[model samples]
Target: SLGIDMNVKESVLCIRLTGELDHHTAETLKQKVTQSLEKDDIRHIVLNLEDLSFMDSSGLGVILGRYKQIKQIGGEMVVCAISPAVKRLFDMSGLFKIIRFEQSEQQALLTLGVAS
Candidate 1:
C-alpha cells in the first residue's frame, strides 16, 4: 500500500509518502512531484517520509530526480523523518550530503524558509 499526499502552497510543495516506495510506485511519485514543481509559486519541496515503511533504489532515484528538478528552478528540497532502513540506504548512496535532512516536516519547511 502506497500513499502520497500533496500540499501545494505559495512557497512550498509538501509531499507526504507512506507505505512501500519501490519501482512500482516510483513513477507515480515522479509524475506528481514534477507536476507540483511546474507551479511557479513553489520555491521549496518538502518530503515528509515519516510514514514511509520501505524504499528501494528506484524510490531514491525518483527523489534524486525531483531534487535536481527543484534545484534547476532555484528551489530547495528537504527530506524529513526517514526510517532507519531508508536512512541507511540514503547514507550508502551519499544522498544525505546533497539533500538536507530534518527531524520533522515543520522543521524542514522552516529551514527552507517556508515557515510551515
Candidate 2:
C-alpha cells in the first residue's frame, strides 16, 4: 500500500511518501500533488522519501511532473531521506541531475528557503 501525506508551511509544501510507488500508486500521487499546487500555488516542495520502499517508472513520472510544475512557476523541489532502492531509481532515470537531494528534512527545508 502507498500513503501520501502533505504539510504546508506558508508557501512551502512538504510531502511524506511511504510504501510502494508504482503504476498503481502514481495517479493518486499525481492528483494529490497537482491539487496542492493548483489550490495553493505552492512556492516550494520538499519530498521526504525515507519510508518509500519501492518505485517504478510511473513513480518517476509523477516526480518529474511535479518538478516541472514547480519549476514553471520559479519554484524549487528537493527530495530527502532517500532509500537505496529509490535512490537507484532516481539515478537510473537521470532525475538526480535535475532534482536536488538533501540529507534530512531540515536540510531540505533549508534548501527550499524555509527555515527549519
Candidate 3:
C-alpha cells in the first residue's frame, strides 16, 4: 500500500508518506509533489517518513527531483523521521550530505520558519 498526504500552510507543503516506496509508487508521488509545487504559494516542503516501511532508488529520485524543482524556484525541501534502514541507504548513497534532515517533522517545519 502507498499513500501521500499533502498539506499546504502559508508557503510550505508537508508531504506524509506511508507504505512501500518503490517504482510502483514513484510516479504517483512525483505527480502529487509536482502538483503541489506548481502552486505559486508553496515554496517549501517537508517530507515526513516516520511511517514509511520500505524504499528504493525510485523513492530517492522522487525526493531529490522535487528538491531540484523547488530549488529552481528558490524554494526549500527538508526530510525527517527516516527509519534506520532508509537512513543507512541515504548514508550509503551520500544523500545524507546533499539532503537535509531534522529529528522530527515539527523540527523540519520550524526550519521553514513555520510552526506545525
Candidate 4:
C-alpha cells in the first residue's frame, strides 16, 4: 500500500509519505510533487516519512529529484521522522547526505521558518 499526502503553506509544501515507496508508487509520488512544483506559491519542500514502511531506489529518486527541483527555484528541502526499516535504504542512497532532518514534522516546519 502507498499513501501520499500534501499540505501547502504560503511558500512551503510538506509531503507525508506512507506505506511502500517502490517503483510502482514512486511514479505516483513524482507526479504529485511535480504538479505541486508547477505552482509558483510553493518553494520549499518537506518530507514527513514517519509512517513510511519501505523504500527502494526509485523512492530515492523521487526524494532526490524533488530536492533538485526545489533547488532550481532557490528553495530548501528537509525530511523528518525516517522510519527504521527505510533508514538504511536511505543511508546507502546518499539521501541522508543531502537532506536535513528534524525530530518531527512540526519541528521541520519550524526549522523552515513557518508556524504551520
Candidate 5:
C-alpha cells in the first residue's frame, strides 16, 4: 500500500493512506507516517482512512507508534473514515478505547481542536 497524502495545518498533520496495509508495505507506511510527525510544529494528527481497504496488526503498530509519539508531546491522534472490517480490528484489540474515530475529516479536525 502507498500512503497518498500528508498535509499540515495549524499543527495538525493529516495523513491519507490508500490500498492495503500489510507486511510488505508496512515499512514504507511507517516511514511516511513518521515523516509527518517529525515536524516539530505539528501537535495533532489525523489519519483519514476513507480509502483504506485492508489492515493488519502491523498497521495497528504503525498507528500505536504514532499515538505514543504524539501523546508524549501532549498531542493527539484521531482516525476517520474507518471501514467496518478495519474498525473491527481496533474494537477486538480494545484500541478503540484509547484511540478514537470520527465520522469525517472535518469531525476529526474538530476533535483535534481544528476547524469543523
Candidate 6:
C-alpha cells in the first residue's frame, strides 16, 4: 500500500510518498499531484520519500515526469528524505544529480526559495 500526503507552501508542493510506490500507486500519486498543480500557483515541488518502503522503475517515471512538467512551468523540484534504498534507485536514474536533495521536507522549501 502507498500513502500520499501532499501540501502546498509558498508555491511549493510537498508531496510525501509513504509505503510503496510501484505501479499500483505511482499513477495515483501522479494523478493527484497533477490535479493539485492546476489548482494552485505551484512553482516548485518536494518529493518526499521518507517512509517509502519500495519503488519500481514506473515509480521513478512518475517522479521524473512531474519534474519535467514542473520545469516547463518554470518551477523547481527537490527531493527530500530519500532513504538509502530509494536514493540508490534515484541515483541510478540520475534524478539525484538533477534535482536538489535535502534531509528534511522543510529544508527543501528553502532551496525552492521559500524560507518558510
User: Residue pairs in steric clash, candidate 2?
Assistant: none
Q: Report the candidate with higher lDDT, 2 versus 4.
A: 2
Q: Candidate 2, after superposition: displacement of residue 46 in Å?
A: 1.7
Error of 1 at 26 (Å): 1.4
Clash counts per candidate, in order, are: 0, 0, 0, 0, 0, 0
Stretches off by above 4 angstroms in model 6 are 36-42, 109-111
**Against the correct fold, how does model 2 do in TM-score?**
0.80
Q: Give the per-residue lDDT digits (tens) of candidate 2, residues 75-115.
A: 77666776666678777767675766655655545347654
Task: Check candidate 3 and list the clashing pairs.
Answer: none
lDDT of 1 at 34: 61
- Candidate 5: give the clashing pairs: none
Give the best candidate by lDDT: 1
Per-prediction TM-score to the true structure, in the order listed: 0.82, 0.80, 0.82, 0.77, 0.80, 0.78
In the range 1-113, model 3's lDDT, one tens digit per residue, is 88777776666777777777887877777686656457675467767865666788877878787766776667776778776677776888887656665567455453465
The sequence of per-residue lDDT tens digits that candidate 4 reaches over residues 1-116 is 88777776666677777777788878887785665456574466667865666677777777777666666656766777665666676677655766555456445452355434
Task: State the lDDT at 79 in candidate 1.
Answer: 73
Cα lDDT tens digits, model 5, 14-85, are: 777776777655666577556645657556776776466767877778777777777766677777777667
Supply candidate 1's per-residue lDDT for 96: 73
Q: Clashing pairs in model 4?
A: none
What would the C-alpha RMSD of candidate 1 be, to one decimal place?
A: 2.3
lDDT of 1 by residue, 1-116 (tens): 78777675666777777777888878778686667557675466777865666687877878777777777778777778675666787788776757656566455453366554
TM-score attained by model 5 = 0.80
Q: Which stretches of candidate 2 lie above 4 Å from their native place?
A: 40-42, 114-116
For residues 1-116, what per-residue lDDT tens digits would candidate 6 score against the true structure?
77777766766767777778788888887685565445456466667765767777867777677666776666666667766776777677676656555567546453475535
**Cα shift from native, residue 27, model 6 (Å):** 1.3
